[PDB]
Write a protein that binds this ligand. Structure first.
Ligand SMILES: *[C@H](O)[C@H](CO)[C@H]1C[C@H](S[C@H]2CN[C@@H](C(=O)N(C)C)C2)C(C(=O)O)=N1
Length: 239
């Protein structure tokens, strides 16, 4: 795991990004813009993780509820269907999570966001968008520590709610490994922020958490985040 071959990966793909790795509470930095690791960015869709935890834990929803599509056009046509929280989770289908956020409400949301200490822990006044255009912001090291705690079932929620949310986040089974994670793309902010935050569950059971964060642009393919993550995790020989 050379802290420079990963740099040629970010150098090549033409971007400014960091990959934060946390192995058993030890944090390492890789990429071509290590300064991004302690700078705040909007969490975009990575916040759905906390949103789901707050919603489940507080019985505003449950993992079997079917969220009904009432027919408005949405940004992607794969969002234009009925789905559960878990399906909405894998599609990053923000209208489902905004309706959840309105159920939770500002007071409960701000109290939970502050109790968890997520990012700057500020949600402002509009319950249904504070994670997409501000004021809520989080550094990539804070995301890796958050997602690390979730992988270890260490966040201040009941175990069953955490386990429910983890099972919403399965991305790949490979070589006997498991990668869990949540993509994120804030396309309105400039520069655009890309997020891919999760963890690797190595066959021995060991857990290594990651927060890939990078500046983004409209023409890039969605797979650019997984590409940059997988070829890195194998270069550090995590996978
Ligand atoms: C929603 O706020 C946002 C999360 O930050 C959405 C938009 C982008 S990309 C978009 C492309 N089609 C969706 C998808 O991946 N599937 C499977 C239909 C999501 C995004 C992201 O992927 O980072 N999440």
């Amino acid at each position: 795991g050379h802290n420079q071959v990963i740099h040629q990966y970010f150098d090549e793909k033409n971007t400014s990004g960091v990959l934060v790795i946390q192995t058993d509470k030890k944090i390492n930095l890789y990429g071509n813009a290590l300064s991004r690791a302690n700078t705040e960015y909007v969490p975009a869709s990575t916040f759905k993780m906390l949103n789901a935890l707050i919603g489940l834990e507080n019985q505003k929803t449950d993992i079997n509820e079917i969220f009904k599509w009432k027919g408005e056009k949405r940004s992607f046509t794969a969002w234009e269907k009925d789905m559960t929280l878990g399906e909405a989770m894998k599609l990053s289908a923000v209208p489902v999570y905004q309706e959840l956020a309105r159920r939770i409400g500002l007071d409960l949301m701000q109290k939970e966001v502050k109790r968890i200490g997520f990012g700057n822990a500020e949600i402002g006044q509009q319950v249904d968008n504070f994670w997409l255009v501000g004021p809520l912001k989080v550094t990539p090291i804070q995301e890796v520590e958050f997602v690390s705690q979730l992988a270890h079932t260490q966040l201040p929620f009941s175990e069953k709610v955490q386990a429910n949310v983890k099972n919403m986040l399965l991305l790949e089974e490979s070589n006997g490994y498991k990668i869990f994670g949540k993509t994120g793309w804030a396309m309105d902010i400039k520069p655009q922020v890309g997020w891919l935050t999760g963890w690797v569950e190595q066959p021995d059971g060991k857990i290594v958490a990651f927060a890939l964060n990078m500046e983004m642009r409209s023409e890039m393919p969605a797979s650019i985040r997984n590409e940059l993550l997988m070829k890195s995790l194998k270069q550090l020989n995590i996978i």
